[PDB]
Design an enzyme around this catalytic site. Sequence first.
Site, PDB file in Angstrom:
ATOM      1  N   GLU A 265      -2.828  13.600  11.934  1.00 51.25           N
ATOM      2  CA  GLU A 265      -3.964  13.188  12.743  1.00 51.25           C
ATOM      3  C   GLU A 265      -5.079  12.755  11.802  1.00 51.25           C
ATOM      4  OE1 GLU A 265      -6.101  16.249  15.023  1.00 51.25           O
ATOM      5  OE2 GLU A 265      -6.445  14.625  16.517  1.00 51.25           O
TER       6      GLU A 265
ATOM      7  N   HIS B  51      -2.442   8.345  11.472  1.00 49.72           N
ATOM      8  CA  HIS B  51      -2.445   8.214  12.922  1.00 49.72           C
ATOM      9  C   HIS B  51      -3.604   7.359  13.434  1.00 49.72           C
ATOM     10  CE1 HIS B  51      -4.153   9.810  16.812  1.00 49.72           C
ATOM     11  NE2 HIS B  51      -2.954   9.392  17.181  1.00 49.72           N
TER      12      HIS B  51
ATOM     13  N   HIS C 173      -3.433   3.252  14.802  1.00 48.03           N
ATOM     14  CA  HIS C 173      -4.061   2.847  16.047  1.00 48.03           C
ATOM     15  C   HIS C 173      -4.958   1.631  15.842  1.00 48.03           C
ATOM     16  CE1 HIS C 173      -2.996   5.072  19.598  1.00 48.03           C
ATOM     17  NE2 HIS C 173      -2.701   6.058  18.792  1.00 48.03           N
TER      18      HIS C 173
HETATM   19 CU   LIG Z   1      -2.200   8.050  18.601  1.00 47.98          CU
END
Ligand SMILES: [Cu+2]
Lengths: 318, 340
Positions: free
Chosen positions: A7, A22, A26
Amino acid sequence: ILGNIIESSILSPNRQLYGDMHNVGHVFLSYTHDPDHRHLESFGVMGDVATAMRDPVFYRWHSFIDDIFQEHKIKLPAYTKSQLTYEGISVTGIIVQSEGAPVNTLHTYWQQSDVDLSRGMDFVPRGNVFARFTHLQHAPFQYVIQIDNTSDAQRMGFVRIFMAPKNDERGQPMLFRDQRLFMVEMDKFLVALRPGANRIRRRSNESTVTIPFERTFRFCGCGWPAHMLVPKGLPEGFPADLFVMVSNYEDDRVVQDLVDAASYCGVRDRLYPDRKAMGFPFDRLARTGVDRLSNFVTPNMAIQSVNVIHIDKTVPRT
Amino acid sequence: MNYKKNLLLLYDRPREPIFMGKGKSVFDVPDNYLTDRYRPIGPEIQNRFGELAEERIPVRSIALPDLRIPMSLGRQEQFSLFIPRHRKIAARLIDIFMGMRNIEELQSCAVFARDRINPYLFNYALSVALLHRRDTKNLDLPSVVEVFPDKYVDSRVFEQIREEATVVPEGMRMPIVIPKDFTASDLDEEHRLWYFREDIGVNLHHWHWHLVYPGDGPDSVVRKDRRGELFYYMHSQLIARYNFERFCNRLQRVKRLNNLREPIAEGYFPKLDSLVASRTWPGRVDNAVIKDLNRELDQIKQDVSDLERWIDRIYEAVHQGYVVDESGNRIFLDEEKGID
Ligand SMILES: [Cu+2]
Ligand SMILES: [Cu+2]
């Protein structure tokens, strides 16, 4: 640890090395149309937390990331028969009942629910503004679970319920190597078992996986929306494997002065109240000998075939 | 008698067709006794071997019993006295050999059957017959080691023998040393009991017991005094003798299989090659787990649960102190007959 790395929260032990993979990915997928900002354009829907699940690619990026997570999981030793067994406890059966439908049948359909948007309508003359949304819904159901206790005392347990496709895409029964990843968590709740037989009743609307329908569509709460609990299914019927497991609550509990007992709220609760890995018992490889869910099970587990029928009617909110 | 002596020739060179030379003799096999492969060239083929022997043995073609069931097992399959289907098949063949009117009709039947039946099966059935028939007592049967060394011997030696026998003249051939302690290395502590587990005599003993106390067959050959108690005691003395060996090899007493659902730590790879099946024996990896069985050809359909259920029923009978027959009466497990 790995979740904080991928993350890339500030809880990452090393962002400079492992990056912000992550979130940045995106951003990459959202800016193909204008990567240097020469077209002075904003980001597609993948770049926004509010909207990313709208885009198909969301599921392909997350699938990529899941493979990293799985690459770790599979290093871990398979749960043993002993780790999965609850000595004394035998779940002899489980069924689901929906009103107005044969046993072991779930039903889905379309519902229209109004939402007022008046609060969202800037510079528009005042008054109620009712938007009528179409969305999937399921008929309420319950689980009836039969559980023999042989140990002469009272036994506490976490009941863990998941459901998965019976068959793969080509209509062949799924092997555990795949099915474990297709297992959808339908509920998790504490229970007190008396010696001898126990009949256990559990309503769809008590699931600890969801929040009330009322949280999504007009005070606290959050989890998965209730109207999405059940997969759509098919008009002709869609076979699924319903699975349940009673695990020893003594080995599951977490000593938390201020603490359903399986309920988790991330704002209120200081500790996640289950000591098992999130996804237990499906999150690891199968021990030697198992090739399918039939072979996997200990007696404190049970399987049931469930038909998930989609009905293509639309219905107002009641 | 010569007739008795001739049956023993059926043991010599199991896979060599019966029309080939056996010792100093040949069988004069009738045309209709040849197998499909050889019958069409029969007269040409029978002569080539038939001008080597001192003796010549006539076989009368007679009407024979139905051998379809004994013939149902393939010639290059393995034979298992544990698999129910095969026990039925063996039971049938013992029936046939037992029921031949006399030794001449036995010879004739066996000569027809041999080249049509799985050699291991043939050998088992015939041997059981010959031990129990009235007219074939005495009759020193050859050891099954001399008849099928492939169930006793590291596979590596067969080509060693084949070379020796082809290259070297008879007067000059030196004996082949059979490898010992050859099925595993020092990493397996279990290797140490090679001198027990893989002894020719220990294994021959196990076979012999099963020839004398067969579990399925005509009543004549099955019903023996206290055979159920012997089953117990024989298997018991093995364990005790085996533990004795374990104490002399810095090992513990053998652990029972606790649980049919836990991995089995002791792998074993036999290094045997069945010349009859023309296929090596499978081995079993360290920490394998018993799996539910579904083998259509074998006719075994059996979950691990079926086995576990039998175990529970027996324990219940032993704790009740009686068993229940099919009529529903109770047979007490008293102190004479309980063990039996
Ligand atoms: Cu995601
Ligand atoms: Cu035995």
